[PDB]
Amino acid sequence: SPYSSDTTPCCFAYIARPLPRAHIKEYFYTSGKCSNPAVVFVTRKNRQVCANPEKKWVREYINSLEMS
Amino acid sequence: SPYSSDTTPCCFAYIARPLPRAHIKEYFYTSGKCSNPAVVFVTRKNRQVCANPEKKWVREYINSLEMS
């Protein structure tokens, strides 16, 4: 191993309500050292949220962020 | 469950070298949704590090932080 001496962002919950696209700084996926793979929406307040890719608005932000 | 819709800080690595007590803002333990329970030293740069309680300097910071 290289040097993964840091905590791992593992999200297991899934907020049913969507978040404000005006406060979603950046998100990212998480898995491997987690019970299940899920998305993580981080706002500008360093607030990490858990979102499942099986929603209709979750993949909406992931698609609006990773544009072409 | 209440509302744990956030990522979980799970540390599995253990830095062999100690950290600078002049940059250790605050630390905390982590477990439950993690493969193993470990400590987490967070500096002022929002840098989360993993430290095991089986070291000689790790419990040193945890004891110097949770004074009486």
mmCIF file of C-alpha atoms in Angstrom:
data_model
loop_
_atom_site.group_PDB
_atom_site.id
_atom_site.type_symbol
_atom_site.label_atom_id
_atom_site.label_comp_id
_atom_site.label_asym_id
_atom_site.label_seq_id
_atom_site.Cartn_x
_atom_site.Cartn_y
_atom_site.Cartn_z
ATOM 1 C CA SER A 1 0.000 0.000 0.000
ATOM 2 C CA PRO A 2 1.059 3.611 -0.602
ATOM 3 C CA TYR A 3 -0.019 5.816 2.331
ATOM 4 C CA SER A 4 -3.790 5.780 2.952
ATOM 5 C CA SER A 5 -3.469 7.012 6.556
ATOM 6 C CA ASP A 6 -6.745 8.974 6.399
ATOM 7 C CA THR A 7 -10.425 8.348 7.219
ATOM 8 C CA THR A 8 -12.708 7.000 4.466
ATOM 9 C CA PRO A 9 -15.967 8.727 3.485
ATOM 10 C CA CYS A 10 -18.438 5.812 3.580
ATOM 11 C CA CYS A 11 -22.106 6.777 3.112
ATOM 12 C CA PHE A 12 -24.771 4.179 3.979
ATOM 13 C CA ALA A 13 -27.842 6.418 4.378
ATOM 14 C CA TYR A 14 -29.780 7.936 1.453
ATOM 15 C CA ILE A 15 -31.574 11.283 1.895
ATOM 16 C CA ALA A 16 -34.979 10.951 0.189
ATOM 17 C CA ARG A 17 -35.220 14.727 -0.348
ATOM 18 C CA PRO A 18 -32.969 16.391 -2.934
ATOM 19 C CA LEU A 19 -30.424 19.125 -2.106
ATOM 20 C CA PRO A 20 -30.067 22.733 -3.276
ATOM 21 C CA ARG A 21 -27.996 22.929 -6.486
ATOM 22 C CA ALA A 22 -26.993 26.427 -5.311
ATOM 23 C CA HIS A 23 -25.021 24.981 -2.369
ATOM 24 C CA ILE A 24 -23.562 21.794 -3.895
ATOM 25 C CA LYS A 25 -19.854 22.664 -4.200
ATOM 26 C CA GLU A 26 -18.726 19.206 -5.368
ATOM 27 C CA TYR A 27 -19.660 15.544 -4.796
ATOM 28 C CA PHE A 28 -17.891 12.172 -5.143
ATOM 29 C CA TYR A 29 -18.558 8.417 -4.904
ATOM 30 C CA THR A 30 -17.371 6.198 -2.028
ATOM 31 C CA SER A 31 -16.912 2.429 -1.597
ATOM 32 C CA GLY A 32 -14.262 -0.288 -1.147
ATOM 33 C CA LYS A 33 -13.821 0.192 2.618
ATOM 34 C CA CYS A 34 -17.580 0.768 3.002
ATOM 35 C CA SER A 35 -20.540 -1.606 3.450
ATOM 36 C CA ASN A 36 -22.036 -0.262 0.199
ATOM 37 C CA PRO A 37 -21.029 2.131 -2.590
ATOM 38 C CA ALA A 38 -22.928 5.450 -2.591
ATOM 39 C CA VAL A 39 -22.555 9.089 -3.699
ATOM 40 C CA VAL A 40 -21.585 12.025 -1.454
ATOM 41 C CA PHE A 41 -22.797 15.596 -2.073
ATOM 42 C CA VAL A 42 -20.483 18.107 -0.355
ATOM 43 C CA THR A 43 -21.775 21.688 -0.036
ATOM 44 C CA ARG A 44 -19.708 24.849 0.545
ATOM 45 C CA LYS A 45 -20.118 24.391 4.318
ATOM 46 C CA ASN A 46 -17.941 21.251 4.198
ATOM 47 C CA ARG A 47 -21.225 19.384 4.781
ATOM 48 C CA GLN A 48 -20.965 15.832 3.394
ATOM 49 C CA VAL A 49 -24.324 14.260 2.469
ATOM 50 C CA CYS A 50 -25.184 10.742 1.245
ATOM 51 C CA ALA A 51 -27.167 10.262 -1.984
ATOM 52 C CA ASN A 52 -28.019 7.021 -3.821
ATOM 53 C CA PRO A 53 -27.617 6.783 -7.603
ATOM 54 C CA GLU A 54 -31.014 5.036 -7.763
ATOM 55 C CA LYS A 55 -32.901 8.328 -7.297
ATOM 56 C CA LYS A 56 -34.237 10.652 -10.022
ATOM 57 C CA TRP A 57 -32.653 13.895 -8.765
ATOM 58 C CA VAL A 58 -29.405 12.371 -7.445
ATOM 59 C CA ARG A 59 -28.100 11.280 -10.861
ATOM 60 C CA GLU A 60 -29.415 14.691 -11.962
ATOM 61 C CA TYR A 61 -26.729 16.564 -9.992
ATOM 62 C CA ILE A 62 -24.035 14.018 -10.917
ATOM 63 C CA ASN A 63 -24.950 14.542 -14.591
ATOM 64 C CA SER A 64 -25.104 18.347 -14.256
ATOM 65 C CA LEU A 65 -21.682 18.347 -12.557
ATOM 66 C CA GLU A 66 -19.807 15.975 -14.894
ATOM 67 C CA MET A 67 -21.016 17.796 -18.029
ATOM 68 C CA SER A 68 -19.214 17.093 -21.325
ATOM 69 C CA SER B 1 -32.840 5.639 12.804
ATOM 70 C CA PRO B 2 -32.681 9.417 13.272
ATOM 71 C CA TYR B 3 -30.971 11.055 10.271
ATOM 72 C CA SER B 4 -27.415 9.792 9.673
ATOM 73 C CA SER B 5 -27.344 10.934 6.026
ATOM 74 C CA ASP B 6 -23.611 11.746 6.135
ATOM 75 C CA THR B 7 -20.330 9.945 5.357
ATOM 76 C CA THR B 8 -18.585 8.034 8.169
ATOM 77 C CA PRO B 9 -14.937 8.659 9.108
ATOM 78 C CA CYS B 10 -13.532 5.104 9.129
ATOM 79 C CA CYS B 11 -9.747 4.858 9.584
ATOM 80 C CA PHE B 12 -8.060 1.514 8.824
ATOM 81 C CA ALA B 13 -4.435 2.635 8.365
ATOM 82 C CA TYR B 14 -2.095 3.553 11.246
ATOM 83 C CA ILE B 15 0.673 6.131 10.697
ATOM 84 C CA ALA B 16 3.802 4.785 12.433
ATOM 85 C CA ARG B 17 5.245 8.300 12.839
ATOM 86 C CA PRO B 18 3.660 10.687 15.352
ATOM 87 C CA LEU B 19 2.122 14.063 14.414
ATOM 88 C CA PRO B 20 2.946 17.634 15.455
ATOM 89 C CA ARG B 21 1.066 18.596 18.643
ATOM 90 C CA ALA B 22 1.229 22.187 17.341
ATOM 91 C CA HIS B 23 -1.117 21.348 14.441
ATOM 92 C CA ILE B 24 -3.513 18.851 16.069
ATOM 93 C CA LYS B 25 -6.744 20.875 16.321
ATOM 94 C CA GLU B 26 -8.915 18.003 17.604
ATOM 95 C CA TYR B 27 -9.206 14.217 17.165
ATOM 96 C CA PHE B 28 -11.962 11.605 17.619
ATOM 97 C CA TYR B 29 -12.535 7.829 17.517
ATOM 98 C CA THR B 30 -14.386 6.008 14.714
ATOM 99 C CA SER B 31 -16.033 2.572 14.413
ATOM 100 C CA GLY B 32 -19.417 0.834 14.043
ATOM 101 C CA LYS B 33 -19.702 1.299 10.261
ATOM 102 C CA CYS B 34 -15.958 0.625 9.878
ATOM 103 C CA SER B 35 -13.919 -2.588 9.531
ATOM 104 C CA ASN B 36 -12.052 -1.680 12.742
ATOM 105 C CA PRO B 37 -12.223 1.005 15.440
ATOM 106 C CA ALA B 38 -9.360 3.538 15.336
ATOM 107 C CA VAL B 39 -8.541 7.141 16.312
ATOM 108 C CA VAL B 40 -8.532 10.152 13.960
ATOM 109 C CA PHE B 41 -6.234 13.167 14.460
ATOM 110 C CA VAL B 42 -7.632 16.224 12.643
ATOM 111 C CA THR B 43 -5.261 19.189 12.205
ATOM 112 C CA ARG B 44 -6.210 22.824 11.502
ATOM 113 C CA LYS B 45 -5.990 22.126 7.750
ATOM 114 C CA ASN B 46 -9.057 19.856 7.968
ATOM 115 C CA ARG B 47 -6.548 17.016 7.469
ATOM 116 C CA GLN B 48 -7.926 13.786 8.978
ATOM 117 C CA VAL B 49 -5.243 11.252 9.977
ATOM 118 C CA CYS B 50 -5.549 7.690 11.329
ATOM 119 C CA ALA B 51 -3.806 6.713 14.585
ATOM 120 C CA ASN B 52 -4.028 3.436 16.538
ATOM 121 C CA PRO B 53 -4.462 3.473 20.325
ATOM 122 C CA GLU B 54 -1.803 0.736 20.564
ATOM 123 C CA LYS B 55 1.036 3.231 19.996
ATOM 124 C CA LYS B 56 3.063 5.098 22.643
ATOM 125 C CA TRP B 57 2.594 8.630 21.265
ATOM 126 C CA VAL B 58 -0.977 8.184 19.981
ATOM 127 C CA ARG B 59 -2.544 7.690 23.425
ATOM 128 C CA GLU B 60 -0.199 10.535 24.414
ATOM 129 C CA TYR B 61 -2.153 13.099 22.363
ATOM 130 C CA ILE B 62 -5.516 11.586 23.362
ATOM 131 C CA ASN B 63 -4.461 11.917 27.021
ATOM 132 C CA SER B 64 -3.097 15.457 26.553
ATOM 133 C CA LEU B 65 -6.349 16.495 24.835
ATOM 134 C CA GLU B 66 -8.872 14.932 27.244
ATOM 135 C CA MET B 67 -7.124 16.379 30.320
ATOM 136 C CA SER B 68 -9.038 16.406 33.628
#
